[PDB]
């Protein structure tokens, strides 16, 4: 259905241990496809998914250039932000940015993104209009004023409405066999007695892509949101994801509980019960 391209930039200062490290990773949906690391022996934009490997040297050279330039810009920016917050030269700090575009099934721009954080806190973001900024504090207002004066929002809008969506559409075609394939979860319910009158029912989902999934437990048809333990969806390492949901139930009452599974790769939602 809908898709996204997103780049994730992390720059971290490390006083006494060289210049700040810059890492950029690119994703289409839940699939990483490139990386760049300023600490690499020979920093280069590198492929991380098979379908991107066909791009020619111009792609790799241009993206490498952009990332080397960005490395320096983020270093200058970290120096600036330290000043905006009256911070000493002794501490380590982090500047993060995530940017990119979302498209619908027809490939048209749904919306664009350009958001930044400093030391894990929201700093500045491009608004959905792709024309104005939201600054989190008086420090970010300095960046906002600079970016307004230089019409940076206009640059982002041009990139997001052009380059970004054009490349996303290209990636989606080149990687269609995986990027446009939803793999349904393999599911089962396990049962583990806790004591003489309580047992855990755990509903498993394995091998699914993309990561978006809904796993719920119902008791007599009512959602057990408060009583359900849901682990974070986790990567298996083969592109797929895993998740479980568990509920503690009175012994003998197991049949009043059903696990419901919703996922894009399923022909229809699943309703599972424990099978003794």
């Amino acid at each position: 259905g809908s898709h996204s391209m997103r780049y994730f930039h992390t720059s971290v200062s490390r006083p006494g241990r060289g210049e700040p490290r810059f890492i950029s990773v690119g994703y289409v949906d839940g699939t990483q496809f490139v990386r760049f690391d300023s600490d690499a022996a020979s920093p280069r934009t590198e492929p991380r998914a098979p379908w991107i490997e066909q791009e020619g040297p111009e792609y790799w050279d241009r993206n490498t250039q952009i990332s080397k330039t960005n490395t320096q810009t983020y270093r200058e920016s970290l120096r600036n932000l330290r000043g905006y917050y009256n911070q000493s030269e002794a501490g380590s700090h982090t500047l993060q940015r995530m940017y990119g575009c979302d498209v619908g099934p027809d490939g048209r721009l749904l919306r664009g993104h350009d958001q930044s954080a400093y030391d894990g806190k929201d700093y500045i973001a491009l608004n959905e209009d792709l024309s104005s900024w939201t600054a989190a504090d008086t420090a970010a207002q300095i960046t906002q004023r600079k970016w307004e004066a230089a019409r940076v929002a206009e640059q982002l809008r041009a990139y997001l409405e052009g380059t970004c969506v054009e490349w996303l559409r290209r990636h989606l075609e080149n990687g269609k066999e995986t990027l446009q394939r939803a793999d349904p979860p393999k599911t089962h319910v396990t049962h583990h007695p806790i004591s003489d009158h309580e047992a855990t029912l755990r509903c498993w989902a394995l091998g699914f892509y993309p990561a978006e999934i809904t796993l719920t437990w119902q008791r007599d048809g009512e959602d057990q949101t408060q009583d359900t333990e849901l682990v974070e969806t986790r990567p298996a390492g083969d592109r797929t994801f895993q998740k479980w949901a568990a509920v503690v139930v009175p012994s003998g009452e197991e049949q009043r509980y059903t696990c419901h599974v919703q996922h894009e790769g399923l022909p229809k939602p699943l309703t599972l019960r424990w099978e003794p």
């Binding site: 780049y7 930039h9 950029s24 690119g26 792609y59 241009r62 993206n63 952009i66 990332s67 330039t69 960005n70 810009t73 983020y74 200058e76 920016s77 600036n80 932000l81 500047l95 940015r97 940017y99 930044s116 500045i124 960046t143 600079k146 970016w147 230089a150 940076v152 640059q155 982002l156 990139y159 380059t163 970004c164 490349w167």
Partner: peptide, 8 residues
């Protein structure tokens, strides 16, 4: 491809 970003 990526964007060449501006200084904060």
């Amino acid at each position: 491809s990526e964007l060449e970003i501006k200084r904060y």
